[PDB]
Write a protein that binds this ligand. Structure first.
Ligand SMILES: Nc1nc2c(ncn2[C@@H]2O[C@H](COP(=O)(O)OP(=O)(O)OP(=O)(O)O)[C@@H](O)[C@H]2O)c(=O)[nH]1
Ligand SMILES: Nc1ncnc2c1ncn2[C@@H]1O[C@H](COP(=O)(O)OP(=O)(O)CP(=O)(O)O)[C@@H](O)[C@H]1O
Ligand SMILES: Nc1nc2c(ncn2[C@@H]2O[C@H](COP(=O)(O)OP(=O)(O)O)[C@@H](O)[C@H]2O)c(=O)[nH]1
Ligand SMILES: [Ca+2]
Ligand SMILES: [Ca+2]
Ligand SMILES: [Ca+2]
Ligand SMILES: [Mg+2]
Ligand SMILES: [Mg+2]
Ligand SMILES: [Mg+2]
Lengths: 437, 421, 54, 352
């Protein structure tokens, strides 16, 4: 057994992290007080769920998680929320004033003064691990902390844990739920400095989660709670292999091995189905073929883009619930004969399939309906480069006039870092084009 | 605990500041004696942003009243909520400033500024994490204009990394006290260009026209004008006084509204301006209409760099997004296309007293150059004949300082013009 | 259409279907970056204070 | 008040559509870089499809189907027809074609020579034509040596397809021709065939014993108006419209245009567009597409119709710009953005 440490940075990372550990507890039968009756080994054990939960002498199961935010109002929710008893104070770290949506302020000004503190609290968790795998880092692109402090944390983690894997869950900026105009700047600045430090990153576009919540859940104006409960379902589907007995994606190294043949192209597209409203009178339960087919519908992707006009480098199918391999292969056969699935010639045209028999858990009183089977597809498509192009274009529009740049230069960042970051994205876009076109 | 320290200087600054604390004190459930008597936890959630908490559960505004003559501040102390202010936070002289920028900035004001900074320092030393400062003042007089901008200068020296924000009342010949107002305003504007992060330009001409034409007030008084400023000051600060993530503090607001450091002068607007229900479409149409603007500049004469809108009350947040997206998509020729998504909307549930719902508008428009042009022309009409300069040279000033303020404001105009094309 | 590496346990199983065969900065350098930016901030504030002193 | 942007200043078709849109008083034109648009009249090359459909509260529509180049490229069309089961290699309405890369660069050289050697041995007519998309650059020859050497002197991909040695020749004149059909596909993927086509005729008598003079073999409107000496003799601008052509087919061949030709054309249009529908459909996409296609057909002396190529940005006959452009506004633009008959199109129903 090897442990995973989850790091939550900024408001997005903290509130998403709050929703994940809520779901993790429901899945593993852990109560808000940390007690796990089903756990017959009191105060220890090297079970699969122990990769995410430590244990005390009193039987408390404590998340292997750190929460970091430069302002205290969001982490204060955790300290007085339902799961306040899960974490001890050392795990929750807050400053007094935030990065003000300014990458330079989170990375340089405030990051320099709090980086050593965060690394110290992470070292404490690491010392409780007999074989640490690596880190899962949740954060947004647009926030000054999510962007600026994360990139600094990723740089130091590569120094302090050279042989450890690092995976990201990143929130891509969407104007429908964003009030910061400079988020394209922060997104590109943090991708540039985190690229060589992240082994695999799962981007979630808020625009996609927003529309899924309006379309499938009939929420006219989704909130962060609605968005985060849906995101934690996808996150749960992705991390289930590390927390339950299995043979696929059993450690963090396997995510790169299976999804990322080229290091810089490490942004798999996530697609999830089914998302059914809980207020529905009663939904006809979808089959393996239908939920699998839904994995190739743009409306269910975590990033709106057209995989029909890209090329696949890898494809994983993560099923949860009543699913047997026979029905999976049948559905895949039918989808090849109908869908436009073009793989790169230097990669086999295949699918790695993982099945966990425990159906998805839904938060009681939540928005999602209990379904008998679900699937999350992780596919490395060149089509996700559309999200880079969209973001890079917005960057170019503002930077051509040096709009807002003085805020970053005022925090000590040099203007050259803007163009250095943009040129690195231009090279990233060219890599996708060389592989897919 | 992100505290803001409030300063009000001069006659105009203290009369508008008084009304401001009267309005938001009501919205937060604070009575004239500082005792809380509201009924919603949303009122106290961010109460510490503008109020200190004294013994006995008393809420005392974090406000500093400054003047070079006692008259106006005596009225405030005798006004409705006069008793709510800290007695030690009244700092005033006896000489007055005679509507003379030089007297407030170099002579009379210099004698008094150190005692004001001592009270500023006392309020900051008791702040858990000070956001910054907001100053209410006029630009056409002597104390608020001359001493106010001296205060900003000395506050920026001692707190260089805090946000400096002002509500600045611009003079107009239609609502004028003395002919030297263009001189005092042109000298102040240069100070503001350098030492403030955000300045809400409140034009007394716009306030007058709104009272005469829209509100149908035959003979508007200074009191009538200040009612519009109160409502506006309460609208623009709602994001700071209640929960939210959209421009929730002064620095985040500045980051979203100011793409270039010197172009930080905002046109504010309010809607509505009597028992009939006001729909979201009506709130939106009016809020973007020039007649509802407080700067007396036609937005259709320039382009919006950034826009921040705040909707207050129980309404359809979906219907708000639809109407906001309808004004942008129906007039995108007035929004610079090189700042994507430069229109941000915030919603607050607590409406203002006596209104089911309202909307407040904050625009960083290049049309604001029309305001600086009016001042510049009035300035030059007198300065070319050196008229009324003796009031200033008698206080140690030289003509060169006027020539430089003039050039500085004409540069500011030219800077707005280039981003408008 | 081939299935390989079928692994079954009590809580699930995994396999692989093949449809067709194919055809850093050191700790020292990070401190320099952080201190270089802090120095540029100090220089900018000194110029501001020098401007205010004039 | 709907908003649109123009990104192809060279399109005569959408220049007229843009003019009509403004006349309605309900459409407003924005700068070509303004992202807040309902409708994009996009550029031909490298249209940024990835930036469409990400504007909150804007239903966005573009006049090109992403991926339709698979049909409108010479080499792509041949590849699509040979590899798509819906069309099969034995497709009977497309001339035998092969994709031939120049030797200075899969490639179907040896496959072409095999079929060529078979014709030469069996006394059959063995005349082929070589062309490419990088042309105004065409060569017609009966010797395989000349066809292949002509492509090597070039540097772009080419296609060698059988030359219809038995074309249908109009009389009087003994002259070749081709049929242009305009087809509009809307956002719901309805296939609308414009009721009005044009025959681009050659004003020179067809000569089978001399492929060196390419004026009587190539019916392009530019070639006939530049290298032909009988331009505009039989019909104005070497353009015969369906009414005249139909009347001719009745007097001469005792048949109608619908029976002998139009049925096959409609069948071909359906087959091609239904084939790529799964790949280019915008049904479940965050933006919508429509596109106007120019199908070019050949008719042989047996009244069998052959598909020559598909044009993704076609021009229109001068006399038919008004009717067709208005039709694009009715079914393609106003169907998504309604304004505050007897259709001019022929709906080719199909299964989605
Ligand atoms: N899905 C989701 N997105 C969020 C959430 N909170 C914030 N965001 C997005 O994150 C971006 C803003 O960044 P934040 O994470 O709030 O900022 P931060 O990391 O706290 O950094 P600061 O600038 O110091 O506040 C916007 O695009 C928001 O839409 C959340 O809870 N869920
Ligand atoms: N296999 C074939 N048999 C007989 N004629 C042919 C032929 N292929 C092409 N042609 C002749 O070539 C002319 C058009 O060639 P083609 O369409 O391939 O080039 P092009 O695309 O530049 C013209 P357009 O796009 O306007 O139709 C037609 O008029 C037709 O008569
Ligand atoms: N809106 C408003 N403007 C005022 C008020 N009092 C004065 N002014 C304006 O402010 C300028 C005079 O400045 P004033 O505040 O009286 O001088 P000071 O006391 O030296 O700062 C003139 O332009 C007046 O029109 C007021 O109560 N409300
Ligand atoms: Ca145990
Ligand atoms: Ca590493
Ligand atoms: Ca004195
Ligand atoms: Mg934050
Ligand atoms: Mg006065
Ligand atoms: Mg062509």
């Amino acid at each position: 057994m090897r442990e995973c440490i989850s790091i939550h940075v900024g408001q997005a990372g903290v509130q998403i992290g709050n929703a994940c550990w809520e779901l993790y507890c429901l899945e593993h039968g852990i109560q808000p007080d940390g007690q796990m009756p089903s756990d017959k080994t009191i105060g220890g054990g090297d079970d699969s769920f122990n990769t995410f939960f430590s244990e005390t002498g009193a039987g408390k199961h404590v998340p292997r998680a750190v929460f970091v935010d430069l302002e205290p109002t969001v982490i204060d929710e955790v300290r007085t929320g339902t799961y306040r008893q899960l974490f001890h104070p050392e795990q929750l770290i807050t400053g007094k004033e935030d990065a003000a949506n300014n990458y330079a302020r989170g990375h340089y000004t405030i990051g320099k003064e709090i980086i050593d503190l965060v690394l110290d609290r992470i070292r404490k968790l690491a010392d409780q691990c007999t074989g640490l795998q690596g880190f899962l880092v949740f954060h947004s692109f647009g926030g000054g902390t999510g962007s600026g402090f994360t990139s600094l944390l990723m740089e130091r983690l590569s120094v302090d844990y050279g042989k450890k894997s690092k995976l990201e869950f990143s929130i891509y900026p969407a104007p429908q739920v964003s009030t910061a105009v400079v988020e394209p700047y922060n997104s590109i600045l943090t991708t540039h400095t985190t690229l060589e430090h992240s082994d695999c990153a799962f981007m979630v576009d808020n625009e996609a989660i927003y529309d899924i919540c309006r379309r499938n859940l009939d929420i006219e104006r989704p909130t962060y709670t609605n968005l985060n409960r849906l995101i934690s379902q996808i996150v749960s589907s992705i991390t289930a292999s590390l927390r339950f007995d299995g043979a696929l994606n059993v450690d963090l190294t396997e995510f790169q091995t299976n999804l990322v043949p080229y290091p810089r192209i490490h942004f798999p597209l996530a697609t999830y189905a089914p998302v059914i409203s809980a207020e529905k009178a009663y939904h006809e339960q979808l089959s393996v073929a239908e939920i699998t087919n839904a994995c190739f519908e743009p409306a269910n992707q975590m990033v709106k883009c057209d995989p029909r006009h890209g090329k696949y480098m890898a494809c994983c199918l993560l099923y949860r619930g009543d699913v047997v391999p026979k029905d999976v292969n049948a559905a895949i056969a039918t989808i090849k004969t109908k869908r436009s699935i073009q793989f790169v010639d230097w990669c086999p045209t295949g699918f790695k399939v993982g099945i966990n028999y425990q159906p998805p858990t839904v938060v009681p009183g939540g928005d999602l309906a209990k379904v008998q089977r679900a699937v999350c597809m992780l596919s490395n498509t060149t089509a996700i480069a559309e999200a880079w192009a969209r973001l890079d274009h917005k960057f170019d529009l503002m930077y051509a006039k040096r709009a807002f740049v003085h805020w970053y230069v005022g925090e000590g960042m040099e203007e050259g870092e803007f163009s250095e970051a943009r040129e690195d994205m231009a090279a990233l876009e060219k890599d996708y084009e060389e592989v897919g076109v | 605990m992100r505290e803001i320290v409030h300063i009000q200087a001069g006659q105009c600054g203290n009369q508008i500041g008084a009304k401001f604390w009267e309005v938001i004190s009501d919205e937060h459930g604070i009575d004239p004696t500082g005792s809380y008597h509201g009924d919603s936890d949303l009122q106290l959630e961010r109460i510490n942003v503008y109020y200190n908490e004294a013994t006995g559960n008393k809420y005392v505004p974090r406000a500093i009243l400054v003047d070079l003559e006692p008259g106006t501040m005596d009225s405030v102390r005798s006004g409705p909520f006069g008793q709510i202010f800290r007695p030690d936070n009244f700092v005033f002289g006896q000489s007055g400033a005679g509507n003379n920028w030089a007297k407030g900035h170099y002579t009379e004001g210099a004698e008094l500024v150190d005692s004001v900074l001592d009270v500023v320092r006392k309020e900051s030393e008791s702040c858990d994490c000070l956001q910054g400062f907001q100053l209410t003042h006029s630009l056409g007089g002597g104390t608020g204009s001359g001493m106010g901008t001296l205060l900003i200068s000395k506050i920026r020296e001692e707190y260089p990394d805090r946000i400096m924000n002002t509500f600045s009342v611009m003079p107009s010949p239609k609502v004028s006290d003395t002919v030297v107002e263009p001189y005092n305003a042109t000298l102040s504007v240069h100070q503001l260009v350098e030492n403030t992060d955000e300045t809400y330009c409140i034009d007394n001409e716009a306030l007058y026209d709104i009272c005469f034409r829209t509100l149908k007030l035959t003979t508007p008084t200074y009191g009538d004008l200040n009612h519009l400023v109160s409502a506006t000051m309460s609208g623009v600060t709602t994001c700071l006084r209640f929960p939210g993530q959209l421009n929730a503090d002064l620095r985040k607001l500045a980051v979203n509204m100011v793409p270039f450091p010197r172009l930080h002068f905002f046109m504010p607007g309010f809607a509505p301006l009597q028992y009939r229900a006001l729909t979201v479409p009506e709130l939106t149409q009016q809020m973007f209409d020039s007649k509802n603007m407080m700067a007396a500049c036609d937005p259709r004469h320039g382009r919006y760099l950034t826009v921040a809108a705040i909707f207050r009350g129980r309404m359809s947040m979906k219907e708000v997004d639809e109407q906001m997206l309808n004004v942008q998509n129906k007039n995108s020729s007035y929004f610079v296309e090189w700042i994507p998504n430069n229109v941000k909307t915030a919603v607050c549930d607590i409406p203002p007293r006596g209104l089911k719902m309202s909307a407040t508008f904050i625009g960083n428009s290049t049309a604001i150059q029309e305001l600086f042009k009016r001042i510049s022309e009035q300035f030059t009409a007198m300065f070319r004949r050196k008229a009324f300069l003796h009031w200033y040279t008698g206080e140690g000033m030289d003509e060169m300082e006027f020539t430089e303020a003039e050039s500085n404001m004409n540069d500011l105009v030219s800077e707005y013009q280039q981003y408008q094309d | 259409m081939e299935v390989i590496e079928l692994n079954k346990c009590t809580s699930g199983q995994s396999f692989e279907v093949i449809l067709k065969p194919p055809s850093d900065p050191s700790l020292e350098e990070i401190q320099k970056k952080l201190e270089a930016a802090e120095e540029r901030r100090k220089y900018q504030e000194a110029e501001l204070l020098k401007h205010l002193a004039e | 008040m709907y908003t649109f942007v123009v990104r192809d200043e060279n399109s005569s078709v959408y220049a007229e559509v843009s003019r009509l849109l403004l006349a309605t008083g309900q459409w407003k034109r924005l700068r070509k870089d303004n992202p807040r648009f309902n409708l994009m009249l996009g550029e031909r090359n490298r249209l940024p499809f990835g930036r469409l459909g990400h504007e909150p509260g804007l239903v966005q529509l573009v006049n090109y189907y992403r991926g339709a180049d698979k049909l409108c490229r010479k080499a792509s069309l041949v590849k699509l027809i040979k590899t798509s089961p819906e069309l099969s290699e034995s497709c009977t309405w497309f001339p035998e074609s092969y994709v031939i890369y120049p030797t200075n660069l899969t490639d179907e050289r040896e496959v072409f020579l095999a079929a060529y050697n078979r014709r030469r041995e069996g006394r059959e007519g063995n005349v082929w034509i070589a062309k490419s998309s990088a042309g105004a650059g065409i060569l017609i020859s009966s010797e395989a040596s000349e066809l292949l050497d002509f492509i090597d002197e070039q540097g772009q991909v080419h296609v060698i397809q059988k030359y219809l040695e038995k074309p249908l020749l109009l009389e009087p004149g003994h002259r070749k021709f081709d049929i242009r059909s305009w087809v509009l596909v809307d956002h719901l993927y309805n296939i609308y065939l414009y009721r009005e086509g044009v025959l681009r005729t050659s004003s020179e008598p067809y000569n089978s014993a001399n492929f060196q003079d390419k004026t009587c073999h190539l019916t392009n409107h530019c070639i006939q108006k530049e290298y032909s000496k009988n331009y505009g003799r039989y019909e104005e601008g070497n353009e015969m419209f369906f009414e005249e052509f139909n009347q001719y087919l009745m007097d001469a061949l005792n048949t109608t245009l619908e029976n002998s030709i139009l049925l096959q054309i409609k069948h071909i249009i359906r087959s091609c567009l239904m084939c790529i529908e799964p790949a280019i459909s915008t049904k479940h996409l965050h933006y919508q597409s429509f596109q106007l296609f120019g199908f070019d057909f050949m008719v042989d002396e047996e009244l069998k119709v052959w598909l020559i190529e598909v044009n993704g940005a076609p021009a229109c006959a001068q006399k038919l710009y008004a009717e067709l452009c208005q039709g694009i506004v009715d079914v393609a633009i106003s169907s998504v953005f309604p304004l505050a008959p007897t259709s001019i199109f022929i709906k080719l129903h199909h299964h989605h």
